[PDB]
Amino acid sequence: FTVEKGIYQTSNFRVQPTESIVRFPNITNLCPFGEVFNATRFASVYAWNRKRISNCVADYSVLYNSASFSTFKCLNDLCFTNVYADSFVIRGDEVRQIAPGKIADYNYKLPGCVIAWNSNNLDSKVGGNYNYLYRLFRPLQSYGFQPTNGVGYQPYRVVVLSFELLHAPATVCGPKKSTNLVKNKCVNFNFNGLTGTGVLTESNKKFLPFQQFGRDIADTTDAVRDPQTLEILDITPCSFGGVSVITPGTNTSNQVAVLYQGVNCTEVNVFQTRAGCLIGAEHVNNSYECDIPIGAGICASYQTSQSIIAYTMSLGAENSVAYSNNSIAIPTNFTISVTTEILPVSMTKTSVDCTMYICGDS
Amino acid sequence: SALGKLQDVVNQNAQALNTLVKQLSSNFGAISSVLNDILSRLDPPEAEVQIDRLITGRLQSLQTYVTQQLIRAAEIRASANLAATKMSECVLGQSKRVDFCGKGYHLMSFPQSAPHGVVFLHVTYVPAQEKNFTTAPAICHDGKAHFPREGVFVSNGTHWFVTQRNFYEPQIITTDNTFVSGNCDVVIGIVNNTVY
Amino acid sequence: TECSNLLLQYGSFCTQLNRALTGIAVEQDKNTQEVFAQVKQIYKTPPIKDFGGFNFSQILPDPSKPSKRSFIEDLLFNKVTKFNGLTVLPPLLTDEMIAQYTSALLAGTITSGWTFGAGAALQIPFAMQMAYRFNGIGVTQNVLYENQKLIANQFNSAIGKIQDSLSSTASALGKLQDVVNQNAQALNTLVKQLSSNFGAISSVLNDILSRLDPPEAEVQIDRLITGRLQSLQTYVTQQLIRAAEIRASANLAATKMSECVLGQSKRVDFCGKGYHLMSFPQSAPHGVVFLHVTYVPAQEKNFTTAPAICHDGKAHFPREGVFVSNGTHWFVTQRNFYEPQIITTDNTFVSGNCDVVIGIVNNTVY
Amino acid sequence: AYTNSFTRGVYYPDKVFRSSVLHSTQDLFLPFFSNVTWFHARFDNPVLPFNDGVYFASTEKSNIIRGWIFGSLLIVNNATNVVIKVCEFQFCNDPFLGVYYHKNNKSWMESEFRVYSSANNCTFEYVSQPFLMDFKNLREFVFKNIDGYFKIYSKHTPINLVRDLPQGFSALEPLVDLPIGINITRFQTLLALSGWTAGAAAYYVGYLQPRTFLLKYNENGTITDAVDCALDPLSETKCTLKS
Numbered sequence A: 001f002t003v004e005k006g007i008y009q010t011s012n013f014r015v016q017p018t019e020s021i022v023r024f025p026n027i028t029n030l031c032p033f034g035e036v037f038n039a040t041r042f043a044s045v046y047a048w049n050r051k052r053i054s055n056c057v058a059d060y061s062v063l064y065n066s067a068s069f070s071t072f073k074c075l076n077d078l079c080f081t082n083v084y085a086d087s088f089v090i091r092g093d094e095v096r097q098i099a100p101g102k103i104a105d106y107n108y109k110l111p112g113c114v115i116a117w118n119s120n121n122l123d124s125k126v127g128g129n130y131n132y133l134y135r136l137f138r139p140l141q142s143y144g145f146q147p148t149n150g151v152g153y154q155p156y157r158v159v160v161l162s163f164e165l166l167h168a169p170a171t172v173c174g175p176k177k178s179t180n181l182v183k184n185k186c187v188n189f190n191f192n193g194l195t196g197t198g199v200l201t202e203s204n205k206k207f208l209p210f211q212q213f214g215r216d217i218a219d220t221t222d223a224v225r226d227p228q229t230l231e232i233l234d235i236t237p238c239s240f241g242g243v244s245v246i247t248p249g250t251n252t253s254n255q256v257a258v259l260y261q262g263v264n265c266t267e268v269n270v271f272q273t274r275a276g277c278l279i280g281a282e283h284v285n286n287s288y289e290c291d292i293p294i295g296a297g298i299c300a301s302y303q304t305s306q307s308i309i310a311y312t313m314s315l316g317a318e319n320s321v322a323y324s325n326n327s328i329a330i331p332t333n334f335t336i337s338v339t340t341e342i343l344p345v346s347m348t349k350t351s352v353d354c355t356m357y358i359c360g361d362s
Numbered sequence B: 001s002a003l004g005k006l007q008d009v010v011n012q013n014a015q016a017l018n019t020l021v022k023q024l025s026s027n028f029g030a031i032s033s034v035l036n037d038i039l040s041r042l043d044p045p046e047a048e049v050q051i052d053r054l055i056t057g058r059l060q061s062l063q064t065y066v067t068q069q070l071i072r073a074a075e076i077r078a079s080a081n082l083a084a085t086k087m088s089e090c091v092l093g094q095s096k097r098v099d100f101c102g103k104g105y106h107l108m109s110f111p112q113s114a115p116h117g118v119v120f121l122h123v124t125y126v127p128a129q130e131k132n133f134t135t136a137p138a139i140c141h142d143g144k145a146h147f148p149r150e151g152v153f154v155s156n157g158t159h160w161f162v163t164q165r166n167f168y169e170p171q172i173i174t175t176d177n178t179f180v181s182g183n184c185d186v187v188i189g190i191v192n193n194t195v196y
Numbered sequence C: 001t002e003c004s005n006l007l008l009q010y011g012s013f014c015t016q017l018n019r020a021l022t023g024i025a026v027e028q029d030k031n032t033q034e035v036f037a038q039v040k041q042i043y044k045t046p047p048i049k050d051f052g053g054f055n056f057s058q059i060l061p062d063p064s065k066p067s068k069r070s071f072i073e074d075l076l077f078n079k080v081t082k083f084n085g086l087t088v089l090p091p092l093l094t095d096e097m098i099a100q101y102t103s104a105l106l107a108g109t110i111t112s113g114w115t116f117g118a119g120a121a122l123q124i125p126f127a128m129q130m131a132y133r134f135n136g137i138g139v140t141q142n143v144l145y146e147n148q149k150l151i152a153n154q155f156n157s158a159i160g161k162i163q164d165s166l167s168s169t170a171s172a173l174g175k176l177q178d179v180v181n182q183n184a185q186a187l188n189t190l191v192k193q194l195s196s197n198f199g200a201i202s203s204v205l206n207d208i209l210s211r212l213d214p215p216e217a218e219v220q221i222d223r224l225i226t227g228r229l230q231s232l233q234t235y236v237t238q239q240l241i242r243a244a245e246i247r248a249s250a251n252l253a254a255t256k257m258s259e260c261v262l263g264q265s266k267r268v269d270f271c272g273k274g275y276h277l278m279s280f281p282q283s284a285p286h287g288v289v290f291l292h293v294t295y296v297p298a299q300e301k302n303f304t305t306a307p308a309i310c311h312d313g314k315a316h317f318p319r320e321g322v323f324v325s326n327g328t329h330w331f332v333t334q335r336n337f338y339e340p341q342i343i344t345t346d347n348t349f350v351s352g353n354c355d356v357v358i359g360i361v362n363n364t365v366y
Numbered sequence D: 001a002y003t004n005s006f007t008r009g010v011y012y013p014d015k016v017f018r019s020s021v022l023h024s025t026q027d028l029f030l031p032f033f034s035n036v037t038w039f040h041a042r043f044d045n046p047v048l049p050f051n052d053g054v055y056f057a058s059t060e061k062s063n064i065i066r067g068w069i070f071g072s073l074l075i076v077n078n079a080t081n082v083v084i085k086v087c088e089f090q091f092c093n094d095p096f097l098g099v100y101y102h103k104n105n106k107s108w109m110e111s112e113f114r115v116y117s118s119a120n121n122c123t124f125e126y127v128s129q130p131f132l133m134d135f136k137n138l139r140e141f142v143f144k145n146i147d148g149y150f151k152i153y154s155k156h157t158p159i160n161l162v163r164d165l166p167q168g169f170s171a172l173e174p175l176v177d178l179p180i181g182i183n184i185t186r187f188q189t190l191l192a193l194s195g196w197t198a199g200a201a202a203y204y205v206g207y208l209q210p211r212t213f214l215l216k217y218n219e220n221g222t223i224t225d226a227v228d229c230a231l232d233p234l235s236e237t238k239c240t241l242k243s
């Protein structure tokens, strides 16, 4: 409850990230799933064409959150080797047959997700549609249609997306959200999985046409190239440092100053020093013997009304000896001075045994 | 605050012991930091996985304490060696070494025992009340240069004397205070005068 | 935050580590202060540089440059060449302040000799000061005044050679460079240790948390904590070991400043090789440099010597010196410089008879 | 036959730009001064094991070396442009790419592709930009298949030799990286080509080995020199001291 005069390291300052920057490369090469579900023409159930795709950005969220479907019997956070996206039309109650039925045993056999949509809008020909061919048994005779049909007899354009988890690397990765880029502000940066904290700025380094990252001798990442745009950005460490409190001692006063080691006073009587930022101490042009060492030649003291002052400590009086080639100074008196020197000699002899300390009669 | 060094040693040791004891209240990932609680709650098969976490925790903390003591004992020994040396050549004799026995020209030292340490009272001679004089390396008397055998030539302004080095006790320059070496032609700063 | 809760189970291992490091940091300021804050006042050399022929221009501060740093100090500084919670604190005494202390110590020695280290600074001509130094190594003071021009030239040439040695070769400051390298790699090793699994699935906590549920992610995190905690322990222990080593070196530099710079040392080989005369401190990065001015005898020649001589049935011994012979005549000379002179009754003392001394000779005393 | 791979087979292991440092990489490299196998384009297009990746040099004029078969897989650097296709190709026992040697065109124009006969199970396909049809340059290639991720490196560097690898230094900038995810246990070389005189093109095979290899990145992030950890004691001490 009482602290003696001095400098004390209380806590640790660290600029909390105003934002967590995440910069996935611009979402391009959109997967052709946009046109699979409403292609100009679809094949028969038995003639289901495989639209296997690789290295495409399949946006399942827009498809899943479309409000223009019939059954989503299953996504953008998962990447897969390929998507065996089928394409066909089934008659009403056959939708339930597409699940892990006439269609389920003759035309299709599901061992992914299933998407269905009202086919009466486009595929249903007016006056009788027979373009599709139906395998009644497993045998292709006809399908049959009527525009004035109900729901169980109504066709449904169904595309069956079957995700693959083969040993081959996943290639159909869904879109990943990205933040914006803000410079000159501590923010957590994650462009392509390289998450970290640092102030983001424009750098002078030139990257190789292929290189994306940059690292220091200690293997730490220092500069990055934005995947969305070819800008070389230097990632400096996010501002942080210790917080130490100058106190002249409770026995003297309760006023204190706070030092933020290694900061510019912009991230926090505010005085900028080579040792950090001083708050609560007023800079004085005078120089005295060091009382409390702030650092970098700066010391803080309590003096007269009273306050804490920060000053550049003085090394002593600026004496100049009256030297000349033919003058000598010779003492005419003397003084007998008895000074003190204190040296530690020994410590306390402490003995400790494990079994008592570690376990204890156990 | 004079005995800061002695108090610092006591404070450092007591602080180290306190942290060692405070470490006994840590869990180290175990269900409890009390060994009895683990024993009285769990069967041996599941108590070992918990007691083992404590053992590594207590053991590591104890090892950290011992190594810190070894390093701390090394500097205390270095201080004791220095204190032993000072007693040998600062209390038991007069030392020419500068600042080894306080600021000034060492005269004598006295030891005083202190808790876990020693205190030396260094008696030193510090000159005071200096005065400015004009001085010469030597004096030419009869074509021969005279040098102070143990002294320095100083001038009141009109007369030349020979004081000792560091206490103004002027003396008449005689052939007993000075020795001759060569003629007064090679020393820079020679000043004419008479040698009684 | 998931880890920070886990790390609390280890108690106060980290209040200990910070206490150990802050204890080291406070010591480093004490080391520098003890070595350099050896002068009560900031003595200044006079504008007139009539030092009997010695020019200390290469060791005195040069106000032309911003740092007001000596010429040789500049050579020393050139020769010697905030990532993961790791901060380097600035020393309490700036390089400019250190260079001011050496200037004060240097200025005091030139103008005062050893007096300023034992009280008030008492001026004395440098040539007369060197006479004290010669007298302090057993050589009479007339040899300095007679050879003042030669001795001054020898000092200037010797100081000139130190410039070439430092400027031409960058390997002279190995001791100071080694300290910098050791600290630099200690931090690099500590930082590089963050890239090791220590047995966990990965060295990145985000991956561990992302790819595992808290139960099985907690065990993986604990492996990282123990390894990273252990690596932080070895760093502090090494620093404590090194800090003790540097403190011993700093304690030695402090003693050398007191005994070599603030006075004349009779201790052999302490302040350079030979007979100590003077020492001049210079400031170097994270260290100090001493220029030990030493008196080395040279060009010896053989002589025939005797312990004493018989004059009138009584043995004469030299008051201070040696008995030497030309092969036909006998003289008495000082030991460290051949300055023969007539053997008289003023430079010898009589004690006893002629038949107790082995090697007695039969010369005459005038 | 065999020759010496003096200081070739060095590329950029990763997508990292580092300035004025010396980086040590335990990677799949070509040992210095190694007895690299020597074939001649007499025509030599045998099947060789694709064990732990493989290097490939080509003193290529008129685009002699036009493809390679791994796995079914191909990297057909045809005349038009690079074409990497992943399918269950029914590769011929003697696969190659046919070229009409100035058959009245006063130019070696590619007109045939006997690399494979048909494709059944296609998984991937990539097509790159075109390039000049041209020897005075040492085109070199490296091929790796790790964790399914299939990597390709190459560089276009001028040289002034005829049939031996020059004693210079060059770094193969990566050009392609694909997740074909197939099993590659063997490979073969497809070259320019009933009745032929294969164009003079010294093409080499160097079975890369996992080895530490110290790289010197200049201030521009482009590799300027390198050494090994097993070439000789001198190299070993350099790598230990990172200098």
Ligand SMILES: *[C@@H]1O[C@H](CO)[C@@H](O[C@@H]2O[C@H](CO)[C@@H](O[C@@H]3O[C@H](CO)[C@@H](O)[C@H](O)[C@@H]3O)[C@H](O)[C@H]2NC(C)=O)[C@H](O)[C@H]1NC(C)=O
Residues within 6 Å of the ligand: A332, A333, A334, A335, B129
């Ligand atoms: C050398 O210095 C010493 C002191 O360090 C001088 O002795 C001091 O002399 C003064 C004046 O003579 C004394 O002051 C007087 O003290 C008496 C009491 O005895 C008082 O009644 C007077 O009114 C006056 O204040 C002083 O006490 C004395 N100090 C000591 C310790 O004895 C000495 O004179 C100096 N020598 C020379 C040659 O200058």
Ligand SMILES: *[C@@H]1O[C@H](CO)[C@@H](O[C@@H]2O[C@H](CO)[C@@H](O[C@@H]3O[C@H](CO)[C@@H](O)[C@H](O)[C@@H]3O)[C@H](O)[C@H]2NC(C)=O)[C@H](O)[C@H]1NC(C)=O
Residues within 6 Å of the ligand: B156, B157, B158, B159
């Ligand atoms: C520096 O000190 C010397 C000391 O010798 C001074 O010279 C001599 O000083 C003494 C003491 O004052 C003189 O004695 C005089 O005696 C007469 C007769 O008894 C008396 O009336 C005077 O008051 C004085 O006491 C002496 O004559 C004088 N000269 C010699 C050759 O001894 C010298 O003057 C001093 N100089 C300065 C600048 O202080």
Ligand SMILES: *[C@@H]1O[C@H](CO)[C@@H](O[C@@H]2O[C@H](CO)[C@@H](O[C@@H]3O[C@H](CO)[C@@H](O)[C@H](O)[C@@H]3O)[C@H](O)[C@H]2NC(C)=O)[C@H](O)[C@H]1NC(C)=O
Residues within 6 Å of the ligand: C055, C056, C057, C058, C160
């Ligand atoms: C004590 O030593 C210092 C140097 O060790 C002397 O100062 C140097 O004196 C020399 C000769 O006078 C100077 O050389 C001249 O330099 C100028 C400028 O470069 C050049 O134009 C002239 O042709 C000539 O070479 C030198 O500059 C000067 N300073 C330094 C740093 O070397 C000093 O004079 C000595 N003390 C004495 C002689 O009392």
Ligand SMILES: *[C@@H]1O[C@H](CO)[C@@H](O[C@@H]2O[C@H](CO)[C@@H](O[C@@H]3O[C@H](CO)[C@@H](O)[C@H](O)[C@@H]3O)[C@H](O)[C@H]2NC(C)=O)[C@H](O)[C@H]1NC(C)=O
Residues within 6 Å of the ligand: C326, C327, C328, C329
């Ligand atoms: C060792 O030292 C003694 C004494 O210094 C040497 O004896 C001296 O020898 C020199 C010439 O060798 C003599 O010089 C002569 O002096 C007379 C004056 O009396 C002068 O008229 C002559 O023209 C000549 O210059 C000197 O007198 C003589 N000293 C004595 C006392 O006899 C001795 O030669 C030295 N031995 C060596 C160097 O081996």
Ligand SMILES: *[C@@H]1O[C@H](CO)[C@@H](O[C@@H]2O[C@H](CO)[C@@H](O)[C@H](O)[C@H]2NC(C)=O)[C@H](O)[C@H]1NC(C)=O
Residues within 6 Å of the ligand: B140, B190, B191, B192
């Ligand atoms: C010390 O005295 C000597 C002589 O006693 C001085 O030297 C003489 O000076 C005069 C006039 O300056 C000359 O005429 C003589 O030739 C010099 N030599 C001799 C042997 O007399 C000398 O100058 C005096 N020193 C001082 C500092 O006054």
Ligand SMILES: *[C@@H]1O[C@H](CO)[C@@H](O[C@@H]2O[C@H](CO)[C@@H](O)[C@H](O)[C@H]2NC(C)=O)[C@H](O)[C@H]1NC(C)=O
Residues within 6 Å of the ligand: C310, C361, C362
């Ligand atoms: C030094 O001189 C003394 C006397 O001048 C020598 O002593 C004499 O020695 C001779 C023969 O050795 C004797 O006959 C005398 O009786 C001695 N006299 C005395 C008074 O002792 C001595 O021998 C000489 N020493 C040397 C080395 O020549």
Ligand SMILES: *[C@@H]1O[C@H](CO)[C@@H](O)[C@H](O)[C@H]1NC(C)=O
Residues within 6 Å of the ligand: A037, A038, A066, A068, A069, A117, A121, A122
């Ligand atoms: C596209 O698909 C939607 C289903 O979400 C369908 O309603 C529409 O008719 C299709 N074609 C066009 C041009 O929108």
Ligand SMILES: *[C@@H]1O[C@H](CO)[C@@H](O)[C@H](O)[C@H]1NC(C)=O
Residues within 6 Å of the ligand: A263, A264, A266
């Ligand atoms: C930040 O601190 C550095 C270090 O002194 C300084 O050079 C820079 O100008 C400061 N920037 C701001 C905005 O205060």
Ligand SMILES: *[C@@H]1O[C@H](CO)[C@@H](O)[C@H](O)[C@H]1NC(C)=O
Residues within 6 Å of the ligand: A325, A326, B188, B189, B190, C050
């Ligand atoms: C001492 O200095 C003054 C002025 O600089 C000069 O006149 C005098 O000759 C010098 N003395 C000696 C002995 O050189």
Ligand SMILES: *[C@@H]1O[C@H](CO)[C@@H](O)[C@H](O)[C@H]1NC(C)=O
Residues within 6 Å of the ligand: C300, C301, C302
């Ligand atoms: C002294 O004499 C010895 C042998 O006579 C010789 O080796 C030595 O060099 C001589 N000393 C000197 C200084 O000449």
Ligand SMILES: *[C@@H]1O[C@H](CO)[C@@H](O)[C@H](O)[C@H]1NC(C)=O
Residues within 6 Å of the ligand: C358, C359, C360
């Ligand atoms: C010194 O030793 C030599 C050795 O030959 C001997 O001849 C001589 O007599 C000795 N003299 C004395 C005084 O011991």
